[PDB]
Amino acid sequence: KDSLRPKLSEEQQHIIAILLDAHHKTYDPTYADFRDFRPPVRMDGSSVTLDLSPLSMLPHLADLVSYSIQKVIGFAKMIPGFRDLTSDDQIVLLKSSAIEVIMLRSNQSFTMDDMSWDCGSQDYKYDVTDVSHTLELIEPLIKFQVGLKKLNLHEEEHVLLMAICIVSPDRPGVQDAKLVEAIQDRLSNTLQTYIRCRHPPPGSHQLYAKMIQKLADLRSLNEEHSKQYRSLSFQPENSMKLTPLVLEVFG
């Protein structure tokens, strides 16, 4: 009867320690690798005036996305249970969730002071103008980042949401949905038990239901990103500007 008091188990504490560590090894908050990307271009080369080419940011953002896909894969491989899956199910899970985990994890650099993704310098501060008929995606995306930022997630909750996103048993092409669902159940119970035992009120009120709604919001952004991407990648001049990994994963 006192056995019903929620307590974070030892396995649940290992899952959190692993996901925290996996995210610390795959997300560099100093953004030092961004210097390896093709440079961002916002000003005209002739650099006190803006560049008017609407794809001038494409080389830079394509390299940023491609790099982030690599980090998402590195993080997913450390999700407890992800490696028990067949290589086909892993590929299906990453192909489906890659752009959603990227948008989740970007919230670390998103700031509500000016509604931009700020990665340590003005070279790597991205606002709406950079990401710019892409407003069909960007306005929802920003509304999403604001809503997520306002949840004020602990880092423990943040990595758990990323792992729950990747291991979704309802993704198209999943073969062994029972195994995927069992892996996600272990993560869901960890997060729910974490909030109840570690997240103080009032911020913890209805927090788990709100987080699951962000997973629901991401599906809609995924579809929206899919439409933009297929129209962009169709023009060979624009797909020349992509990377092989992005073409394989998003194609």
Binding site: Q70, I73, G74, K77, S87, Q90, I91, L94, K95, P244, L245, E248, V249
Partner: peptide, 10 residues
């Protein structure tokens, strides 16, 4: 037909 993504999971 996902050789790079497959290589990254190894």
């Amino acid at each position: 037909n996902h050789p790079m993504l497959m290589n990254l999971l190894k």
